[PDB]
Design an enzyme around this catalytic site. Structure first.
Site, PDB file in Angstrom:
ATOM      1  N   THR A   1      91.250  54.224  13.458  1.00  0.00           N
ATOM      2  CA  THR A   1      90.683  52.959  12.976  1.00  0.00           C
ATOM      3  C   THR A   1      91.728  51.881  13.185  1.00  0.00           C
ATOM      4  OG1 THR A   1      91.282  53.574  10.706  1.00  0.00           O
ATOM      5  CG2 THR A   1      88.924  53.706  11.303  1.00  0.00           C
TER       6      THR A   1
ATOM      7  N   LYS B   1     100.084  62.543  16.534  1.00  0.00           N
ATOM      8  CA  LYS B   1     100.072  61.102  16.789  1.00  0.00           C
ATOM      9  C   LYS B   1     101.181  60.667  17.746  1.00  0.00           C
ATOM     10  CE  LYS B   1      97.749  60.041  12.392  1.00  0.00           C
ATOM     11  NZ  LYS B   1      96.641  59.193  12.917  1.00  0.00           N
TER      12      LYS B   1
ATOM     13  N   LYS C   1     100.998  54.072  11.700  1.00  0.00           N
ATOM     14  CA  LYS C   1     100.049  55.084  11.212  1.00  0.00           C
ATOM     15  C   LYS C   1     100.894  56.164  10.545  1.00  0.00           C
ATOM     16  CE  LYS C   1      98.932  55.098  15.416  1.00  0.00           C
ATOM     17  NZ  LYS C   1      98.152  55.308  16.655  1.00  0.00           N
ATOM     18  N   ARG C   2     100.245  57.138   9.906  1.00  0.00           N
ATOM     19  CA  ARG C   2     100.965  58.239   9.257  1.00  0.00           C
ATOM     20  C   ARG C   2     101.778  59.035  10.290  1.00  0.00           C
ATOM     21  NH1 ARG C   2      99.723  59.747   3.758  1.00  0.00           N
ATOM     22  NH2 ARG C   2     101.194  61.416   4.304  1.00  0.00           N
TER      23      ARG C   2
ATOM     24  N   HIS D   1      86.037  64.764   9.635  1.00  0.00           N
ATOM     25  CA  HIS D   1      87.099  63.881  10.140  1.00  0.00           C
ATOM     26  C   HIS D   1      88.226  64.675  10.791  1.00  0.00           C
ATOM     27  CE1 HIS D   1      85.731  60.469   7.509  1.00  0.00           C
ATOM     28  NE2 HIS D   1      85.403  61.456   6.695  1.00  0.00           N
TER      29      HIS D   1
ATOM     30  N   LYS E   1      91.583  47.712  14.640  1.00  0.00           N
ATOM     31  CA  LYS E   1      92.185  46.565  13.939  1.00  0.00           C
ATOM     32  C   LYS E   1      93.030  45.726  14.901  1.00  0.00           C
ATOM     33  CE  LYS E   1      92.570  49.558   9.836  1.00  0.00           C
ATOM     34  NZ  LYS E   1      93.495  50.316   8.957  1.00  0.00           N
TER      35      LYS E   1
HETATM   36  C1  LIG Z   1      94.017  51.424   9.374  1.00  0.00           C
HETATM   37  C2  LIG Z   1      95.034  52.119   8.619  1.00  0.00           C
HETATM   38  C3  LIG Z   1      95.350  53.525   8.863  1.00  0.00           C
HETATM   39  C4  LIG Z   1      94.686  54.411   9.908  1.00  0.00           C
HETATM   40  O1  LIG Z   1      95.377  54.218  11.138  1.00  0.00           O
HETATM   41  P1  LIG Z   1      95.279  55.094  12.462  1.00  0.00           P
HETATM   42  O2  LIG Z   1      96.204  54.408  13.399  1.00  0.00           O
HETATM   43  O3  LIG Z   1      93.859  54.984  12.795  1.00  0.00           O
HETATM   44  O4  LIG Z   1      95.739  56.439  12.049  1.00  0.00           O
HETATM   45  C5  LIG Z   1      96.319  54.141   8.126  1.00  0.00           C
HETATM   46  N1  LIG Z   1      96.995  53.457   7.159  1.00  0.00           N
HETATM   47  C6  LIG Z   1      96.750  52.127   6.873  1.00  0.00           C
HETATM   48  C7  LIG Z   1      97.568  51.491   5.785  1.00  0.00           C
HETATM   49  C8  LIG Z   1      95.780  51.432   7.582  1.00  0.00           C
HETATM   50  O5  LIG Z   1      95.552  50.115   7.291  1.00  0.00           O
HETATM   51  O1  LIG Z   2      87.336  59.063  10.129  1.00  0.00           O
HETATM   52  C1  LIG Z   2      88.445  58.374   9.562  1.00  0.00           C
HETATM   53  C2  LIG Z   2      89.754  58.987  10.013  1.00  0.00           C
HETATM   54  O2  LIG Z   2      89.860  60.281   9.373  1.00  0.00           O
HETATM   55  C3  LIG Z   2      91.091  60.961   9.665  1.00  0.00           C
HETATM   56  O3  LIG Z   2      92.145  60.217   9.161  1.00  0.00           O
HETATM   57  C4  LIG Z   2      91.264  61.168  11.175  1.00  0.00           C
HETATM   58  O4  LIG Z   2      92.540  61.724  11.423  1.00  0.00           O
HETATM   59  C5  LIG Z   2      91.122  59.848  11.942  1.00  0.00           C
HETATM   60  O5  LIG Z   2      91.100  60.099  13.346  1.00  0.00           O
HETATM   61  C6  LIG Z   2      89.830  59.138  11.537  1.00  0.00           C
HETATM   62  O6  LIG Z   2      89.782  57.858  12.149  1.00  0.00           O
END
Ligand SMILES: *Cc1c(COP(=O)(O)O)cnc(C)c1O
Ligand SMILES: OC[C@H]1O[C@H](O)[C@H](O)[C@@H](O)[C@@H]1O
Ligand SMILES: COc1ccc(O)cc1NC(=O)NC(=O)c1ccc(F)cc1Cl
Ligand SMILES: COc1ccc(O)cc1NC(=O)NC(=O)c1ccc(F)cc1Cl
Ligand SMILES: *Cc1c(COP(=O)(O)O)cnc(C)c1O
Ligand SMILES: OC[C@H]1O[C@H](O)[C@H](O)[C@@H](O)[C@@H]1O
Lengths: 791, 791
Positions: B636, B534, B528-529, B337, B640
């Site tokens: 991910t 990012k 996101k984090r 990942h 969403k």
């Molecule tokens: C989906 C999700 C993430 C991952 O988000 P990215 O924008 O893909 O980094 C992180 N935290 C929570 C709470 C989520 O629901």
């Molecule tokens: O594979 C699941 C996730 O793993 C890590 O959080 C990566 O930073 C992200 O890009 C990926 O979507």
């Protein structure tokens, strides 16, 4: 009914345990039954607490750092009148109820008699229908599990909550903050306690079912929760450490900061909860508080409740000092459990100043007003001031918690006639002179539910077949058994019940220890916490004397005995741990000697706790209550043995005096020095070497221990015992040796005559009625709490 | 049905919660409903696990240190088809289901994408009816609760288990010992790992219901338990500390000893449990192991599973090395990942020698058999040896866990087409050359249950009314929505669903924050984090650019926006915490400016977690997925937003590329430099001073941050941000600024045309089908695990 209990059990196994009969464990079956039994008291639990809210009777709050509850499954089934139906429900399902009951961990949140008293009291208060609540700490670890390794005591953590507790129910909404450390600020707004560390208190309620009534009371126990990042999260363990483990000290004061934290934690959480409940009820606004609240202090352990209620009254509720003090005195009552100096709580002022700065200011203020009142009465007596002060100025300044409890309570009580007299006329003589109506007696008791109906179903059944089932709610009805004094049919049935209990317990002894138990032997038992005052060492000197008598003349007549001595020693108590090593070393020499054989076996019963007490007590013939006169406040083990068909060998100490009064002195084996004879030996000066050189029987015993007959590998091992016995024995073991062995000879002579032994046993059971905790509670209710037993 | 659910709720409120309607709390009501819902799963849970024991299909074990599960109540109600019935039952009882749902604590046992992927996977494996199990750690504290005080992130312990978890069940009979430290002895009876420190592993099972089927799988989470007296009991916290808290590091390696203890703890307990289940099933005996067991390694976090399976096979099961290694490779599969160098796990050999001496021996022996092959294939290539070695000799010796994972697995996968290519052809080029068939791609996905049916019932209902409900189990059916492009009424129905979600979330924003939200404004969201990669900083630059445009020309036509930026920053990550304070400082100036008003509002969404993601995502118009090309492995969050009716602004990074492939590039707002153009700027040399002087709008933004326009009381506060941007920016923020602002102008232009905006939205939803985790799991099942979907 039976059919619905099976349906409920199967429903719990499925939905709560997520199992079918194919892969369910014995633990799953225990939980399924526990949840089914708890479900049957919910209706009465809600209704009882609802009744207290609706009618507002005066409430009794038993505040204790200890609640030695033991196992609750069987106790609850009996009190709810569900045992027969549950027994049949479990049988029809093809299961063994004894196997399910044995899975349950003891709620061993107590050290000994003090904690067991609190547990017996909860059962009695609920049976009497009193609005009573037990308040304590939900220790994650209770009294340690004891193991004997290489003849020595080893401690293992009592992880009783590992697999959960089906009896408790968390009360999230009643979580309260408890404050620690910080500093005092004296502003124009008043006195404030600021910059404090907060620890949350989460309460857990456990049901206390009354015997065959509609009452189910509550025992509320508090658990401590916390309010580099990883390290900050790991450091939350420090706050949770307050409710982690029970201090394993029985009749001994160990002044640790963590113990003071525990004492304040329970006090602060409890008082806030009581005040909240008062304010929520139908009742300047605190004038009716002592008419609605009675808080009983079980020892000086929760003594901080006095300045804490004063802190809430004066700092938070803004009530003036004088009125706040009047209300505090009328709310509290204190129960003293010991006269031993080493057992008394004397907290260093510096430790209290750091942890509880506002409480120290309040204690000083109470002492100031207390001392100013003694100056107004006695101006010329300067020594009475330092003697009555809550502060002991000598060297390292300490707070006398007993003195704090006396001034802050309206009633102070001892636990047996002889004890309450020493507390009144001797120890706190100066206090009893000022207020004569404050000091009183409340002779201890035990619950006949756990200590007869549960532990001894055979004797309970026997008594019921002869005089009726009315004895459970009124134990004084046991006197009706006197109608069977000359009856040889009853005396044989009484011995058969004792034999059935002995045979069941002998099966347990042979699987845990490599010993061949003689079925016709006299079960000589001394089970209590290991102490120099309780004198397990005197018992050991007798076991050795018997061994030396068998080796001298092998073919002589000897009445067979199985000497069982059990109990836990406080981990830091060196002398008690040495006594255990001596008993196990003597045991190995006596049990493996081919000349003795079936004549004498010695067993150190490991892990003595409530559940094991329930097994050993009904199997006992002779009860050892051999404490030095004036040292055992009451004792409760003595009453358990008396109710269960055993005879008592003991000194005129504690409740043994009252047992002798009720059954007739000739019906107990009383020996040794009395309170006056111990005091007459203190003035003359105790010289232990005189008894050693005068009595040849004691000389051989002590020489064998000193030379290394019981320890061939380490001959210097028991030197700490010998040096104590000769120069530092405050409990005068050698002074009661002659009278003990002579008394033990009389016990042996009576055992050879089954008819006379059993006639004496009948007189003891028939006169054990006063020792019901129902009697003890009725007295506390009438003369201290001012509450009425409702039905 | 409704009436039966009401009765069950009432039964639970009475027996499980010991309450009536008078004193019952909101928490009590949640628990009563939770237990009622769990009861409906029990039958199918027992039957599913019984089916796996009886038929023995190939089992899948998803081994992860993270499971970002969120709330379980609504998800379980939806998957069992009981939501509508429960909503009606709760309404009839005079309560609000949404209020009861808010009491539930999130099971935040994850950091971000990695942990959420594991959660989506469990839901998908259960929906497809695979014999799947989730194995992780039951952290007492999950990802910290984030509070904002004075504009800064403050961490608070996530005490999620304080009031209990109704969705778990302890499994006492499956408690296992885990070994640490000790030494190794190579005797004549095999190798022995002795004198170890033991920590017990207690498993807790949580139900994973499949969507509308008969499958309910298990998520097994392990808790650490321990095997001066007081201090010894308190020191039991040290063993329990292993499962205390989740390490809050997202895409960052922190080499703490406690983290290594956690990684081994989960691995040892999991593998011992898998082997026990294998041996206890119907059918040397380990030849069939890889045909009955598949273990997926979620990142390198549980890499220790390889030498541990080898340890059990060789030392305990006495299988030879060659056979043990063959089985190990066919059992494991690894999912990469990471892209960043600082994210890779490189554990020091000294730390591993001290803690796991036998595992290091096995890792050394794996490395030896690995290097001997490279000498046999490429003799004159000595640099390929140090490159492919599992041990890094540079300075203080470290173990490359990624290399261990590749050699010990039969399959290795990336999480998006672009990522998997870089993993195969660049990062692990030397490994792919030896074994091409090992490296694969498995593009990420999200569950349409939690991420559509749950979070957006309005959109789910609208889609179902037009194309039926088959889309939930096969999301590729959303392509049928292409037939409604010229349907003006459907476009209006789509817009209303978004407006109702925006209104519902605007209520949340007005209640939690003291800001007035414009309902007609575009919801511009980046959640996101917080990380430099990012680029929440790039978003912040655009927010300031828009602010300046309103201040320079107040009468100009501006499309109103509500810019929402949210996410947690790792505690030890200074730059991420500075970015949070920059956003909050910008927010306070923008929201309180009278010249701006309802034109622009900025919100830093606090405590971003799964339950909050469910609220914000359906209310979004514009999704910000602006990471630097080649830095985001997949993402991910992007998926969403696409499924929920939001348009995406982003770079050609991760899964954004594949979103563009499915929807059509013209239907996404793609900007900036691509993978090849970032590599060309690295070759030439990045000079951030060039873009500062060439762009006048960036000049005003950077001068305002450096001079203290956003921090008047501390002018030099954002000095670290300016220093990083000009000299140490590996993620080239200034290089993408121009193309970003230009792309954002295009977004604003399209928002003024609702018909064009909504037509583009429909093209996105209709093409979001590939991104279902059901599709992802089907590919893992076919190409890696060799398992077949069933019902
Ligand atoms: C989906 C999700 C993430 C991952 O988000 P990215 O924008 O893909 O980094 C992180 N935290 C929570 C709470 C989520 O629901
Ligand atoms: O594979 C699941 C996730 O793993 C890590 O959080 C990566 O930073 C992200 O890009 C990926 O979507
Ligand atoms: C292996 O599972 C079983 C096999 C045969 C059976 O007759 C029963 C079972 N299992 C079972 O009865 N229960 C469970 O498997 C179970 C127990 C606890 C828990 F939390 C979850 C489950 Cl599903
Ligand atoms: C104060 O108690 C009540 C008063 C009026 C009521 O209508 C109901 C109650 N109490 C109640 O419903 N339950 C309890 O009091 C209760 C809750 C939890 C628990 F563990 C034990 C009890 Cl007895
Ligand atoms: C009754 C009891 C005691 C108190 O016994 P004494 O002999 O009175 O000291 C101590 N421990 C247990 C387990 C008991 O049941
Ligand atoms: O009052 C209960 C008990 O408290 C203490 O344990 C005393 O030592 C004991 O004599 C008494 O019976």
């Amino acid at each position: 009914n039976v059919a619905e209990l099976k349906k409920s059990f199967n429903r719990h196994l499925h939905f709560t345990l997520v199992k079918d009969r194919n892969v369910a464990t014995t633990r799953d079956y225990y939980f399924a039954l526990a949840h089914t039994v708890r479900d049957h008291l919910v209706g009465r639990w809600i209704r009882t607490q609802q009744h207290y809210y609706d009618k507002c009777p005066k409430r009794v709050y038993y505040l204790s750092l200890e609640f030695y509850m033991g196992r609750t499954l069987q106790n609850t089934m009996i009190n709810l009148g569900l045992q027969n139906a549950c027994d049949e429900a479990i049988y029809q399902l093809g299961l063994d109820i004894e196997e399910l009951e044995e899975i349950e961990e003891d709620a061993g949140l107590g050290n000994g008699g003090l904690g067991r008293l609190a547990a017996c009291f909860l059962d009695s208060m609920a049976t009497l229908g009193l609005a009573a609540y037990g308040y304590g700490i939900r220790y994650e670890y209770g009294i340690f599990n004891q193991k004997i390794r290489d003849g020595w005591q080893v401690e293992e953590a009592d992880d009783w909550l590992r697999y959960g507790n089906p009896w408790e129910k968390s009360r999230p909404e009643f979580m309260l903050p408890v404050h620690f450390y910080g500093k005092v600020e004296h502003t124009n707004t008043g006195t404030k306690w600021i910059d404090t560390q907060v620890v949350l208190a989460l309460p857990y309620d456990t049901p206390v079912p009354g015997y065959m009534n509609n009452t189910v009371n509550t025992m509320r126990l508090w658990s401590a929760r916390a309010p580099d990042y990883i390290q900050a999260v790991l450091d939350r363990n420090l706050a949770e450490n307050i409710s982690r483990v029970l201090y394993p000290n029985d009749n001994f004061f160990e002044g640790k900061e963590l113990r003071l934290k525990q004492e304040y934690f329970v006090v602060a959480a409890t008082l806030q909860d009581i005040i909240r409940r008062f304010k929520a009820s139908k009742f300047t606004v605190f004038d009716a508080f002592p008419d609605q609240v009675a808080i009983q202090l079980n020892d000086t352990h929760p003594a901080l409740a006095i300045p804490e209620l004063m802190r809430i009254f004066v700092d938070i509720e803004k009530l003036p000092w004088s009125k706040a003090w009047e209300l505090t005195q009328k709310t509290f009552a204190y129960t003293n459990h010991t006269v031993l100096p080493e057992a008394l709580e004397r907290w260093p002022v510096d430790l209290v100043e750091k942890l509880l700065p506002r409480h120290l200011e309040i204690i000083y203020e109470i002492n100031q007003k207390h001392l100013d009142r003694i100056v107004a009465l006695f101006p010329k007596d300067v020594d009475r001031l330092r003697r009555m002060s809550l502060i002991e100025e000598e060297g390292s300044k300490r707070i006398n918690m007993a003195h704090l409890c006396i001034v802050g309570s309206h009633a102070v009580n001892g636990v047996a006639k002889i004890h309450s007299d020493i507390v009144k006329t001797k120890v706190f003589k100066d206090f009893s002179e000022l207020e004569p109506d404050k000091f009183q007696n409340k002779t201890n008791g035990i619950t006949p539910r756990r200590w007869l109906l549960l532990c001894n179903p055979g004797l309970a059944e026997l008594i019921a077949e002869k005089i009726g089932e009315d004895y459970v709610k009124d134990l004084s009805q046991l006197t009706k058994l006197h109608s069977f004094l000359g009856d040889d049919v009853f005396l044989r049935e009484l011995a058969k019940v004792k034999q059935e209990n002995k045979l069941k317990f002998s099966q347990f002894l042979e699987t845990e220890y490599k010993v061949k138990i003689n079925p016709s032997s006299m079960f000589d038992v001394q089970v209590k916490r290991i102490h120099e005052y309780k004198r397990q060492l005197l018992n050991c000197l007798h076991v050795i004397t018997m061994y030396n008598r068998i080796k001298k003349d092998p073919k002589k007549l000897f009445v067979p005995r199985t000497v069982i001595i059990g109990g836990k020693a406080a981990p830091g108590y060196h002398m008690a741990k040495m006594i255990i090593k001596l008993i196990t070393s003597v045991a190995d020499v006596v049990n493996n000697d081919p000349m003795v054989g079936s004549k004498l076996k010695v067993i150190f019963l490991e892990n003595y706790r409530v559940s094991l007490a329930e097994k050993v007590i009904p199997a006992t013939d002779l009860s050892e209550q051999i404490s030095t006169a004036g040292t055992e406040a009451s004792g409760t083990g003595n009453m358990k043995f008396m109710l269960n068909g055993a005879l008592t060998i003991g000194t005129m100490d504690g409740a043994n005096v009252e047992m002798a009064e009720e059954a007739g002195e000739e019906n107990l084996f009383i020996f040794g020095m009395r309170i006056d004879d111990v005091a007459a030996l203190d003035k003359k000066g105790y010289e232990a070497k005189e008894y050693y050189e005068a009595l040849p029987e004691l000389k051989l015993v002590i020489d064998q221990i000193d030379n290394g007959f019981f320890s061939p590998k380490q001959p210097d091992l028991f030197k700490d015992i010998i040096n104590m016995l000769f120069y530092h024995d405050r409990f005068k073991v050698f002074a009661d040796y002659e009278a003990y062995v002579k008394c033990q000879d009389k016990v042996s002579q009576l055992y050879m005559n089954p008819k006379a032994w059993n006639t004496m046993v009948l007189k003891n059971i028939a006169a054990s009625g006063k020792f019901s905790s129902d009697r003890t509670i009725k007295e506390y209710a009438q003369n201290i709490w001012n509450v009425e037993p409702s039905d």
